[PDB]
């Protein structure tokens, strides 16, 4: 049966034949609706942006004219090798962002002492001479460097990592709390430890707990930050943060997600600067560094060499007692019943990380919300662990 193309007569008949009497009117009205909407959107338009003009009470217009005429604009550049200035070769390599690199002299305003390698130099636009160093002035409350003084989490909050928390206690407390014992045992206090374990194990939380116990401020540094836009002057970032830590009292330096940094030119500058701030800075200081990443090998081989990071604490997935302790800790902040079998939930989620446990508790809360109940039940936790964990076979051949 060959298909027959719809003839013009068939097209005409099929269009009209059986149709609503109102169909023509409906189609016309709908098209007019679209045209009218387009017309409204055309005739509203031109929304005023109203740029950031302050009230006229603050305009010293003459002064702005004078600063426009006088004050020169300086491009921002990254400095490089000093090329042995020593008043005989006052020249430096400066990389003016994407524009280019140049070799430039100083300005009468600046001095050689405050200009070195690596900081932000404000070069002019004609001769490109460095006219003012601009330290990044980072002190970053707009981003990472947690700078939390006394983290809310405590020794009770961390659960399961008892061996881990004990090893951490030793290393970052026994020198910190009892320096005399290490002094009279004839050994330099532990220079640092690399807290390695599968992600989500809670190593960060355990570190913050000991920080709260030590009453020493906890500094957490991310790596992706200085992999992304804020690259380059990261050496000056760590310089200033270590400096303020020296100004600060007993401290606790903690590098998480440092795998990104360890795994490299400006990055290499960052770790040789921290070499200068760890080996060059006396190992007797109270700015103990707490290294922590899942990768135990991606760290640069020159980092864990003796006279530097000295031991390694191996965090592992929490056990049954650990899992039930984490469950109780996370459920304390939830509206649940008092007879929840948290040992049962810990059993039902073997080889489950702490993050998985908090997600299970969150899903239990959502399940309780689903039935519009103000209190989560054990059935909700069972369904939550059925959903999160496991992302007939185990019921018909095993028994």
């Amino acid at each position: 049966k060959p298909i027959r193309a719809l003839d013009e007569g068939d097209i005409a008949l099929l269009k009209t034949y059986g149709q609503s009497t109102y169909s023509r009117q409906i189609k016309q009205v709908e098209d007019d609706i679209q045209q009218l909407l387009k017309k409204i959107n055309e005739l509203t338009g031109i929304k005023e942006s109203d740029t950031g003009l302050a009230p006229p009470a603050l305009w010293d217009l003459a002064a702005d004219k004078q600063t426009l005429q006088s004050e020169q604009p300086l491009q921002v550049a990254r400095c490089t090798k000093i090329i042995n200035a020593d008043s005989e070769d006052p020249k430096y390599i400066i990389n003016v962002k994407q524009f280019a690199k140049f070799v430039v002299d100083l300005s009468d305003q600046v001095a050689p002492t405050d200009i070195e390698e690596g900081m932000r130099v404000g070069v002019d636009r004609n001769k490109y001479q460095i006219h003012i160093p601009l330290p990044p002035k980072i002190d970053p409350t707009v981003t990472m460097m947690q700078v939390e003084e006394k983290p809310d989490v405590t020794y009770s909050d961390v659960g399961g990592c008892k061996e881990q928390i004990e090893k951490l206690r030793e290393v970052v407390e026994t020198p910190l709390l009892h320096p005399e014992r290490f002094v009279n045992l004839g050994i330099e206090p532990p220079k640092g430890v690399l807290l390695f374990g599968p992600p989500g194990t809670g190593k960060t939380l355990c570190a913050r707990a000991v920080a709260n116990r030590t009453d020493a401020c906890f500094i957490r540094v991310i790596g992706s930050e200085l992999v992304q836009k804020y690259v380059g002057e990261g050496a000056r970032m760590v310089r200033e943060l270590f400096e303020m830590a020296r100004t600060k009292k007993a401290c606790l330096i903690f590098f998480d997600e440092i795998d990104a940094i360890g795994g490299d030119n400006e990055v290499q500058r960052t770790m040789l600067e921290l070499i200068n701030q760890l080996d060059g800075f006396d190992p007797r200081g109270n700015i103990k560094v707490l290294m922590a990443t899942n990768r135990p090998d991606t760290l640069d081989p020159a980092l864990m060499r003796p006279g530097r990071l000295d031991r390694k604490i191996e965090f592992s997935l929490p056990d049954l007692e650990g899992r039930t302790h984490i469950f109780k800790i996370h459920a304390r902040s939830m509206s649940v019943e008092r007879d929840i079998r948290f040992e049962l939930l810990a059993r039902l989620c073997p080889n489950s990380t702490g993050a998985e446990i908090r997600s299970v508790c969150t899903e239990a809360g959502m399940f309780a919300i689903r039935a519009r109940r103000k209190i989560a039940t054990e059935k909700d936790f069972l369904e939550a662990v059925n959903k999160v964990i496991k992302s007939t076979p185990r019921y018909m051949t095993y028994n």
Partner: protein, 238 residues
């Protein structure tokens, strides 16, 4: 790289561990909890049914089976592997009753069953036998000339006298509870109450008639599996 030592039971790890036997051990954690307690008045066995469907006939699920009138069994692991183990246990008990015309002790029962086990790595399997470790843990209880006796059998073939042992998906928690709730002169009735308490505390579902099979062996009576009404009587107290 543990994978090269993973494959096969005849391979030694650098740490000397039998990884396939360890996996058979861990395969017990996929079986329903079984609890057995040793008392001077006898031994009680309590298990978790884990009923898949209310339509299923409960009598088919055999967590507790009778090897002999004087001995009881509790199981946790693969149903098939157990079935073979239980058949061998019964056959060996009847072999002892034939040759020596005496009731063979539960220690010798678990010895023979372990003899059938731990035979995965052996050349006597040419006519046909297990080339892999048995993946079922055995809880043997009964009364013999040494009074009541309870023995737990390890999939590797290891057996130990246990005053109170719990096997299954919840061996750790139930064992931890039995660690502090067990007492030497504990009576059989309070022992059964304690066992049901632990099972209720550790069960995923609520305690009823169809979630537990209960067995008991005392020097006077023979092997007794608690019927429905006896289960209701023992479960109303808890």
């Amino acid at each position: 790289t543990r994978s090269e030592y993973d494959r096969g039971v005849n391979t030694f790890s650098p740490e000397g561990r039998l990884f396939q036997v360890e996996y058979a051990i861990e395969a017990i954690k996929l079986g329903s909890t079984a609890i057995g307690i040793q008392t001077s008045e006898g031994v009680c066995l309590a298990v978790e049914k884990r009923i898949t469907s209310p339509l299923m006939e409960p009598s088919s699920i055999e967590k507790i089976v009778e090897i002999d009138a004087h001995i009881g069994c509790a199981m946790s692991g693969l149903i098939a592997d157990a079935k073979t183990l239980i058949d061998k246990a019964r056959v060996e008990t009847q072999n002892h009753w034939f040759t020596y015309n005496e009731t063979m002790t539960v220690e010798s029962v678990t010895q023979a069953v372990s003899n059938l086990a731990l035979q995965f790595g052996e050349e006597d399997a040419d006519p046909g036998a297990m080339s892999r470790p048995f993946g079922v843990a055995l809880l043997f209880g009964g009364v013999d000339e040494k009074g009541p006796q309870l023995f737990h059998m390890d999939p590797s073939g290891t057996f130990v006298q246990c005053d109170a042992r719990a096997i299954g998906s919840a061996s750790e928690g139930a064992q931890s509870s039995l660690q502090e709730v067990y007492h030497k002169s504990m009576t059989l009735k309070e022992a059964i109450k304690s066992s049901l308490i632990i099972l209720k505390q550790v069960m995923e579902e609520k305690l009823n008639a169809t979630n537990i099979e209960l067995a008991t062996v005392q020097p006077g009576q023979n092997f007794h599996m608690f019927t429905k009404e006896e289960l209701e009587e023992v479960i109303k107290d808890i």
